[PDB]
């Protein structure tokens, strides 16, 4: 549960708060799939 | 001319370099439309 | 059980097979969140 | 002139009208870059 090296770590400047929330949504979307990857297929 | 009065300015931490390049592409996509918004009609 | 009362149903023509696979990935991303929405809290 | 030799042609069923408008926006985004690809440099 959480330990050695995680994935790399970059950043991105998003101008405008409106579109900002839009990108954040896609961010959690991809990160969610990653959590389903190391999960037993069952 | 130009003026520092741009929209707000936020940021986002994108883990993984692979997924990073993916988000960056979408960023330039929306920003491109913004440049076409201030384009005088014809 | 299930019931055909799903949300609306539209479509989108994606030219290019390369870009096609890219959009399809985002589709499953949002749909995944929907499945977590009806997940009873705990 | 033009020629019907465009890229492949696939499709995608997007449930929900709300999320539909979201994907459509990304579609025009990538297509815009394609139009800038065949733009003679200067």
Swiss-Prot record, chains A, B, C, D:
Result of mutating residue 3 to A?
A: Loss of nuclear localization
Q: What's the impact of mutating residue 21 to K? A: In a sporadic cancer; somatic mutation
Disorder association: TP53 is found in increased amounts in a wide variety of transformed cells. TP53 is frequently mutated or inactivated in about 60% of cancers. TP53 defects are found in Barrett metaplasia a condition in which the normally stratified squamous epithelium of the lower esophagus is replaced by a metaplastic columnar epithelium. The condition develops as a complication in approximately 10% of patients with chronic gastroesophageal reflux disease and predisposes to the development of esophageal adenocarcinoma. Esophageal cancer: A malignancy of the esophagus. The most common types are esophageal squamous cell carcinoma and adenocarcinoma. Cancer of the esophagus remains a devastating disease because it is usually not detected until it has progressed to an advanced incurable stage.
Positions bearing the Glycyl lysine isopeptide (Lys-Gly) (interchain with G-Cter in ubiquitin) cross-link: 33, 39
Q: What is the effect of changing residue 6 to E?
A: In sporadic cancers; somatic mutation
What effect is documented for mutating residue 26 to P? In LFS; germline mutation and in a sporadic cancer; somatic mutation; impaired ability to tetramerize and undergo liquid-liquid phase separation
Q: What is the effect of changing residue 11 to I?
A: In a sporadic cancer; somatic mutation
Functional description taken from the UniProt entry: Multifunctional transcription factor that induces cell cycle arrest, DNA repair or apoptosis upon binding to its target DNA sequence. Acts as a tumor suppressor in many tumor types; induces growth arrest or apoptosis depending on the physiological circumstances and cell type. Negatively regulates cell division by controlling expression of a set of genes required for this process. One of the activated genes is an inhibitor of cyclin-dependent kinases. Apoptosis induction seems to be mediated either by stimulation of BAX and FAS antigen expression, or by repression of Bcl-2 expression.
Which protein family is it in? Answer: Belongs to the p53 family.
The short sequence motif called Nuclear export signal sits at 21-32
Query: What happens upon changing residue 28 to A?
Result: In a sporadic cancer; somatic mutation
Please list where the region (Interaction with HIPK2) is annotated.
1-42
Subcellular location per UniProt equals:
Cytoplasm; Nucleus; Nucleus, PML body; Endoplasmic reticulum
Summarize the PTM comment. Answer: Deacetylation by SIRT2 impairs its ability to induce transcription activation in a AKT-dependent manner.
Look up what happens after changing residue 20 to I: In a sporadic cancer; somatic mutation
User: Which residues does this entry mark as bearing Symmetric dimethylarginine?
Assistant: 17, 19
Quaternary structure, from the entry: Forms homodimers and homotetramers. Binds DNA as a homotetramer. Interacts with AXIN1. Probably part of a complex consisting of TP53, HIPK2 and AXIN1. Interacts with histone acetyltransferases EP300 and methyltransferases HRMT1L2 and CARM1, and recruits them to promoters. Interacts (via C-terminus) with TAF1; when TAF1 is part of the TFIID complex. Interacts with ING4; this interaction may be indirect. Found in a complex with CABLES1 and TP73. Interacts with HIPK1, HIPK2, and TP53INP1. Interacts with WWOX. May interact with HCV core protein. Interacts with USP7 and SYVN1. (Microbial infection) Interacts with cancer-associated/HPV E6 viral proteins leading to ubiquitination and degradation of TP53 giving a possible model for cell growth regulation. This complex formation requires an additional factor, E6-AP, which stably associates with TP53 in the presence of E6.
- What's the reported outcome of changing residue 5 to R? In a sporadic cancer; somatic mutation
Q: What is this protein called?
A: Cellular tumor antigen p53
